[PDB]
Design a protein around this ligand. Structure first.
Ligand SMILES: Nc1ncnc2c1ncn2[C@@H]1O[C@H](CSCC[C@H](N)C(=O)O)[C@@H](O)[C@H]1O
Ligand SMILES: CCCCCCCCO[C@@H]1O[C@H](CO)[C@@H](O)[C@H](O)[C@H]1O
Ligand SMILES: CCCCCCCCO[C@@H]1O[C@H](CO)[C@@H](O)[C@H](O)[C@H]1O
Ligand code: NA
Length: 466
């Protein structure tokens, strides 16, 4: 019965510690994952996350919210040193017991909100399921702190339950109470990505920094076993932001708390009822089972520059050709809507990732020695340069076939061939699909009652191979 006893940051801070207090009697993987059968998922999930990290030889790592330390255990195998923290005492105690055989782990009991360390004191800030237990202001404050603590070239890993609990709404799998309110913040995936990209931090030497969000990916184990695409994680690098201006906590908070979630909601309203893509009819006359063999993996790239509706229906692709699909998105809000679709369809063959550019996705897949079976893309030539397009082959099998739908103004077929021939393509054919696209786009808009105009561009449908 004290001042603002229902709403202060401390009361809200303590509501999370109280929630986790309920599990301190069970310092086990069930609590860490809030899943009655966490044994089924734990090792595969941990491997999904740990295999996404950079090598840690000679590096200092801080694992914040480490709990019983299932990541700490493996992180300290290669890192020079790991600081492992959690605000639940028994969890840290269980952490110290499991890891009694190791000698390069420091332990701390405390709230992540109050954690303090020297500038440029770590190389990796590792978290997994933590931001969702902080307020919007605390998330921003946490990220500015990570920025302070990281050395240049340093990384931060984050993984959050986005939009819904890991166990969905609501699985008997959950360890959540069916009657108690759940205090957890299930934010949209797009908000995390945008916040990370927005941050500009000036250090004590007066140097500016920004985050390079290397990727956004769904945790594979949660798709395969929980039909959940919204367990989202990101690897993010601290890099110089020459000439940029600082972003304050208040300036970031306005965006993160009000502006962005609002903008996301308008995109949900436009895209969530999408029954098919207007491009389906167009791609139908260029994609066959010679382009997409049965059980192959297709690489799909949809930047959605000219229009949010210009993309590839990856679900229809996977359905009609019995293939797996990786679809790259570059627009945060539109990537989120693809995750929404993925969760409702529950076709595990279809996967999405967010990257800043084509080059970003190519690096990711290069590092993983991927060789996709084909490419289907909208706006490839329109949005990417020769250098990036030429590097697509480094993630394609020999003779992989491609199909491109391209918005153009004047039709310059000779020039289009020369770009693609310069970027390593062969057997190039070009078909003008402007009238077909005009018909299909209008049919699609009227059918979905979108009060919008046509993209208004001409279209080429291109097929080639490498
Ligand atoms: N503000 C905070 N400071 C420190 N630890 C926190 C915290 N908020 C939540 N936690 C801890 O974060 C953990 C959440 S569950 C996930 C545990 C671990 N990251 C893993 O994936 O296995 C719990 O251990 C909880 O106690
Ligand atoms: C994203 C573009 C959607 C294209 C789907 C259109 C219908 C595809 O039709 C497919 O054609 C194949 C012939 O090669 C058959 O083997 C498949 O059984 C059939 O589903
Ligand atoms: C569903 C999408 C997730 C899988 C992404 C993996 C990247 C491509 O993986 C590739 O898949 C091919 C199978 O067609 C294999 O033959 C290749 O060896 C493999 O590199
Ligand atoms: Na989401």
């Amino acid at each position: 019965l004290y001042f603002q006893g229902h709403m202060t940051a401390e009361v809200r801070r303590d509501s999370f510690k109280t929630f986790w207090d309920k599990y301190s009697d069970k310092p086990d993987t069930n609590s860490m994952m809030l899943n009655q059968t966490a044994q089924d998922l734990e090792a595969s999930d941990r491997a999904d996350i740990l295999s996404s990290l950079p090598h840690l030889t000679n590096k200092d790592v801080v694992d914040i919210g480490a709990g019983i330390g299932r990541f700490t255990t493996v992180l300290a195998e290669t890192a020079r040193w790991v600081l492992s923290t959690d605000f639940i005492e028994s969890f840290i105690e269980k952490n110290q017991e499991r890891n009694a055989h190791m000698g390069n782990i420091s332990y701390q009991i405390g709230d992540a909100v109050h954690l303090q360390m020297d500038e440029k004191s770590v190389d990796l800030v590792f978290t997994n399921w933590l931001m969702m237990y902080l307020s919007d202001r605390e998330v921003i404050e946490f990220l500015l702190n990570a920025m302070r603590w990281l050395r240049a070239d340093g990384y931060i890993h984050l993984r959050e339950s986005c939009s819904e609990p890991s166990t969905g709404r609501l699985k008997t799998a959950t360890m959540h109470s069916a009657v108690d309110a759940n205090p957890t913040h299930y934010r949209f995936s797009s908000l995390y990505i945008k916040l990370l990209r927005a941050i500009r931090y000036r250090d004590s030497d007066g140097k500016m920094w920004k985050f390079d969000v290397q990727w956004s990916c769904s945790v594979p184990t949660y798709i395969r076993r929980c039909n959940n695409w919204r367990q989202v994680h990101w690897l993010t690098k601290k890099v110089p932001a020459v000439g940029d201006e600082e972003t304050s906590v208040d300036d970031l908070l306005n965006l993160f708390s009000q502006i962005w979630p609002a903008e996301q909601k308008t995109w949900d309203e436009k895209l969530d009822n999408e029954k098919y893509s207007w491009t389906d009819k167009i791609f139908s006359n260029a994609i066959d089972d010679e382009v997409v063999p049965k059980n192959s993996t297709a690489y799909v790239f949809t930047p959605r520059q000219r229009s949010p509706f210009l993309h590839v229906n990856s679900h229809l692709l996977a359905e009609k050709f019995t293939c797996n699909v990786w679809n790259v998105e570059t627009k945060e809000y539109l990537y989120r809507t693809s995750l929404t679709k993925a969760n409702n369809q529950k076709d595990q063959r279809v996967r999405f990732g967010w990257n800043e550019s084509l080059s970003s996705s190519i690096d990711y897949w290069n590092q993983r020695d991927a060789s996709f079976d084909c490419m289907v893309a909208t706006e490839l030539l329109a949005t990417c340069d020769d250098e990036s397009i030429n590097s697509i082959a480094s993630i394609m099998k020999p003779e992989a076939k491609v199909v491109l739908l391209e918005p153009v103004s004047g039709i310059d077929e000779t020039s289009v061939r020369q770009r693609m021939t310069t970027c390593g393509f062969k057997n190039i054919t070009i078909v003008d699909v402007t009238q077909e696209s005009l018909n299909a786009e209008v049919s699609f808009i009227k059918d979905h009652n979108l009060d919008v105009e046509l993209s208004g561009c001409n279209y080429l449908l291109i097929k080639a191979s490498l």
